[PDB]
Symmetry: C4
Subunit: 389 residues, 4 copies
């Protein structure tokens, strides 16, 4: 580092930020946040586990899936709303649990996320971190609409007292569901943080069990989503104990490196749910690496009831507050609407597997290392040139 | 978004552009064009939809196909002519439609392509854009030969009167086919272009988003002109088109300018044609192909899988934009020569002889995404090294 | 080939080397070492055979394997201890043998690794090189714990007297196994090393090129020590070894320092073990594995495929070369911690629970060589772009 | 470019060339030749057809093949000699037809290649280009040994006169075989040449046929090798008309781009020759991309009776004359001898397929294009650092 070059920082965000309606991608947010946040706000957001392969593979795995679009379909009118978890929602995506948004947005934090999510026309669901820089309550009333649905993610404590008080507290406060993170019994090693800063907590119980969940069902009517599943064998398990849904997630490539990409697990497990009757029973959400509407459409096409994005909404918020979060919402809505149209379908229910080319899902390759010498002495062809005067 | 750079640019167009006979390949026009077109002519020509993957993948797919050349064949004499949509043509490729050719050739635009195509000993079909700078009237009158063939690319307006008028107008003017574009109900989001200026908006009256199979069936009744459905991205819609009895189809994703993650047309081609035999609709429907074609060996692969002809857009745009009409001819010339030589070395002498027995198709589906690599392992790794030369 | 650079270097060793507690991962020792070892200590440690592909591929192969973690498991308590060659050890990894440790730790060499291993709360087996700077006498006397275990890496001399003497000497000194290296009949050609100085020569008396199965069978008679054949590169020779009844085998290609295009040991492991069941030689032979292991998740994959333990060379070399003995301990410590955390998140609590049901093996064989790409297509292609920040 | 910077050139080759016994690879030759030859000597040597994919793929395809080496084998003694085409040879490799060696070696040319090939202990066969800068005769007596075998490659002319005189001429002059190039009916487009320089000949007949070959059998007793085959279907054909051998070759990636790699064709066709009895009948040689002994061993392992290298021997010769050519010979001999030893076999006849891992021969991949934006804003992990004073 922190270094009177948070003076160079304050230059950048000062007006030098381009007009919010010059932002095109979710990547644009990320570039801008990369240059401006404090070294440690940035480390904490961008960071992944160890060598960061899963964090990246989460994204790249969408690129193993292509489209077989229908043409000569009337797409004048398209509708991207659907139902997640009792409520009915405007988009098929949501903000996912990011902890500690005061590092990026100092004054307003995850209040400004709630503003963003129903301050404009489109109304998006919001997961709230158990490590929120704000209180659940602070957030929920910063909301500009009773129509905007909210969701609580929960680290069950080792004091089954404290976490019983929280479930009763959040019920009383509006939230229409409970998202129980289970992929962080030990917090993952994020070395970008450490290098600059120069793994069991009690906040998060590693004792957590299936039986402990079965019990969380009884103590509440709120729908329950085991957020952090990483194989088919445990989706089936969540069905077998009839929880509401499940997020296919690996905590944003932040827990176990070489966890697979949710999109690839998704594609494995939805066929297995039809082959066991369990289709209807479980909502199957999906996060990680999602940065474009075509990603969101691949997920939905495969079976996802809804798809979460974390870091992007941090980065937008971190840069442009609640307004950032909305533009980012609209950005993604427009991406989804156009690609649907070009896909040749008009509702989320028509987003099926027969729209996807899945022939190369499994082409997750590692090439043999480059012949250094052969390639150093090779000279490629050259483009024709121009001249003199 | 241009900046008395016009002089930096004009200075290169200026005699710095090398002689036309110094152009070896199609990639040269593309380079010359990148340095001399106006910032937004370049963005509009060069760009594709969103992250731009289909656009690139259209080309690279050609490279998952290899050859099984026949040796010891009398390849003295080679005929690259074939037939498209009922005309006989000199060449098994065509100039796909490309809107706004004045951005890069302000004086003559599409008229100069029409001359490039019909002027030389080798002449090539020209599809004309519905949203071309010039009039069809102007572009057709511009043609140097009666024998040269020009097709019409149609966007059906949502005011089907305007459209009925247009079709009537262009069959009167003597165009030989209608390429109705179906891959743009919403206009693709090309971000290099947007990044310069600074959802119902990317819909518009001028290209009807409700165009349907039933429409094309009616289009077919209202005209004697052969109809080609341009913009098909899956085998399912080639069959649908064989069923309404239309003359043909372009497997195409609009040069990667509409839907990202549309497959490479060559890939759709290769799965499509076998099915077109399995249901004996083989020669009931001419299947064209476009996107990412830049070499004559590219063309050969598509012909060997069964395409009736293969289209090119940006390369003719870039050639026309640096060298106007003799640019266009040079590219025809360059690509023609590529097809001829590669045909000899492939071991065939005609277009009808270009069949699948010549392709090695085994690695066609090796569309890979590698696992992200190990920035740290590679960071500290030091590679071998060449020997040196001493000191002085 | 060193050049009063020794000061440039000494200046970094100098207090510029960061505190040991600032080392996060094994790649850090490797970097620090690259800047501070003497030009030819670095070439001898870092180098591999010829174009160096196996050496790199040993690592990257680990990355064609992914995990199927078990969730909602009581992972409060985790035991990373297992058993090797009849001893019980704290940890499922070991320090493979590495010759000439004084090049990088001139004062103490192998003795410092022996202390790094036996000194802390967590202690780790040490294989000792036949061609180590120090004496076995010296390295064994250097050990901090009775409980710590040290193995002997044997090259059989072509004068089998010298060898008979050696084996006798080291069982007297209390080593717990003999790792006879069979992957160096000719010594691999490491060109970074050769490039500094400026076929019967790369053969030598000191490592007998005629070593045979019949020899190892006799070696086994002459000693009570468990024997491990170190350097096996195919399943066929694991079976041959189960047949002469030897205690075990290291699937290994010598850290990529002998034969280029030897397969990744993890790959040989994964095909080998299933066969070791199919012929019920499952627990008749302990299969170790080495090369390219740098993360605790690397170790886990090998354990999950059935390896009895997994070895590391260069990383302990580099750690010992920057930080001597507390370097070594830190790496043990670092790698141990990696294995523990990754075990929790994998959903298991012991080494016996690490089985194949946890690995995703489907893309294990996607060892690709991509087609050379299109320098010209990519040359003129311009990629999308991020938005900007204004001016001041 | 040609430009009184052939003055910078003459600097380099002047003594600045490292001692010939500081050369380790065939690549080292290539680097040195890259810096020294005239722009056009270099263009003409390095050049490939069009985009140069086949030229490169020729090499890289060896890297799809790995080894399953035998250990605990007595390899004290190894023997790499074998028989090619009547004669018995010291190595299993040979120099292949490179045309025009006076561009690189001005005074001595392909005479210095013949010196190189039997001037030292090991004695390697030499193909002589029909476009040799020297006469067949000039070369053959520049040879320092009657033991060193020679070979003539032949462009049949359209004047079946001129080429009938040549076959009778070369017979009379020693050459133990005839190599009929058939992959250049039209000369391939080499754009590196053209760019600096700013496709039917009669020298080379495109009328050439199978029947024309059948006839070349009768007019000579010299063994005949149809050099330039690129599919299995034509190896079979060469057998069917009982010619002696055949080179699996695509003229060094200089004729048809997207011709396959000879090593991959080799592996396809040798099984097909056993499955049709034709194993014994045909010698199957192999060139392209061969730069290391491990390449040469993969070929042999698969069935190759012998493996040709072109450009490397040009580059060595171009730099160090006949002495260059020998060192390059010995370099490759030592590579072959060591890797055999480490392979655990002692004669060329024991080099079989069971030594090779062929499971990924067919992993000739094209990856999907890189996500430019995602990768631009990504920041990798970073190595720990060092400090201050
Ligand atoms: C900065 C940071 C903090 C996070 N904190 C939590 C948390 O407390 N609980 C949780 O379940 N997920 C947490 N996540 C993960 C997400 O809810 C989500 O699973 C992840 O961000 C999805 O990946 P993405 O960022 O690529 O979209 C966090 C993610 C980030 C990047
Ligand atoms: C600048 C630009 C304008 C285009 N305009 C049209 C158009 O108006 N109508 C149409 O049907 N296709 C249009 N296309 C698509 C092409 O006809 C063609 O499918 C594309 O150029 C094929 O890709 P390529 O540029 O890789 O060869 C356009 C393409 C470009 C690049
Ligand atoms: C500098 C160096 C010296 C080695 N010396 C020996 C040796 O004397 N004997 C032996 O059996 N292995 C020796 N090895 C091989 C290792 O024991 C081990 O197999 C290798 O280090 C595993 O690869 P890694 O460095 O990727 O972990 C040596 C390796 C290195 C890098
Ligand atoms: C400079 C140059 C000239 C060549 N001239 C001929 C020729 O006249 N006839 C022929 O059959 N091959 C000719 N070749 C090809 C070779 O004999 C051989 O097939 C090729 O060089 C093998 O590939 P490599 O250089 O990668 O080893 C030539 C190759 C080069 C590089
Ligand atoms: O940052 C995180 O990934 C996270 O999940 C978390 C959980 C609890 C407290 C702080 C952060
Ligand atoms: O730019 C284009 O790709 C295009 O086809 C088009 C279509 C209609 C209007 C403008 C451009
Ligand atoms: O350097 C080596 O890899 C090695 O193992 C060794 C073996 C014998 C002598 C010297 C080094
Ligand atoms: O250079 C060549 O590839 C070649 O084969 C050749 C053939 C005849 C004359 C000159 C060159």
């Amino acid at each position: 580092g922190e270094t009177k070059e948070d003076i160079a920082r304050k230059e950048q965000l000062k007006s030098l930020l381009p007009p919010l309606d010059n932002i095109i991608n979710l990547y644009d947010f990320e570039y801008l946040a990369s240059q401006t946040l404090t070294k440690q706000a940035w480390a904490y957001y961008s960071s992944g586990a160890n060598d960061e392969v899963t964090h990246r593979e989460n994204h790249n795995a969408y690129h193993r899936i292509f489209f077989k679009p229908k043409i000569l379909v009337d797409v004048r009118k398209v509708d991207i709303s659907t139902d997640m978890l009792g409520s009915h929602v405007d988009v098929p995506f949501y903000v996912s649990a990011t902890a500690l948004c005061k590092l990026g947005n100092p004054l307003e934090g995850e209040k400004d996320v709630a503003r963003g999510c129903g301050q404009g026309v489109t109304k998006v669901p919001q997961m709230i971190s158990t490590a929120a820089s704000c209180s659940p309550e602070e957030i929920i009333e910063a909301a500009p609409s009773d129509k905007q649905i909210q969701w609580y993610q929960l680290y069950v404590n080792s004091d089954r007292k404290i976490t019983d008080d929280l479930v009763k507290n959040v019920e009383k406060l509006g939230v229409k569901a409970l998202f129980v993170t289970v992929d962080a019994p030990s917090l993952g090693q994020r070395e970008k943080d450490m290098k600059l800063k120069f793994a069991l907590s009690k906040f998060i119980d590693p004792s957590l069990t299936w039986k402990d969940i079965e019990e969380l069902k009884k103590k509440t009517k709120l729908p329950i989503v085991i957020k952090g599943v990483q194989r088919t064998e445990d989706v089936i398990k969540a069905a077998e104990i009839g929880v509401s849904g499940v997020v296919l997630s690996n905590h944003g490539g932040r827990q176990l490196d070489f966890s697979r990409a949710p999109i690839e697990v998704l594609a494995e497990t939805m066929p297995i749910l039809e082959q066991r009757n369990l289709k209807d029973k479980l909502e199957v959400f999906v996060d990680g690496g999602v940065r474009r509407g075509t990603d969101v459409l691949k997920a939905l096409c495969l079976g996802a009831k809804g798809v979460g994005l974390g870091r992007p909404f941090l980065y937008a918020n971190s840069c442009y507050g609640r307004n950032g979060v909305e533009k980012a919402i609209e950005i993604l809505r427009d991406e989804i609407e156009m690609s649907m149209r070009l896909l040749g379908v008009t509702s989320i229910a028509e987003l099926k597997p027969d729209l996807l080319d899945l022939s190369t899902l499994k082409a997750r390759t590692v090439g043999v290392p480059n012949d250094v010498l052969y390639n150093e002495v090779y000279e490629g062809p050259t483009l024709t040139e121009f001249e003199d005067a």
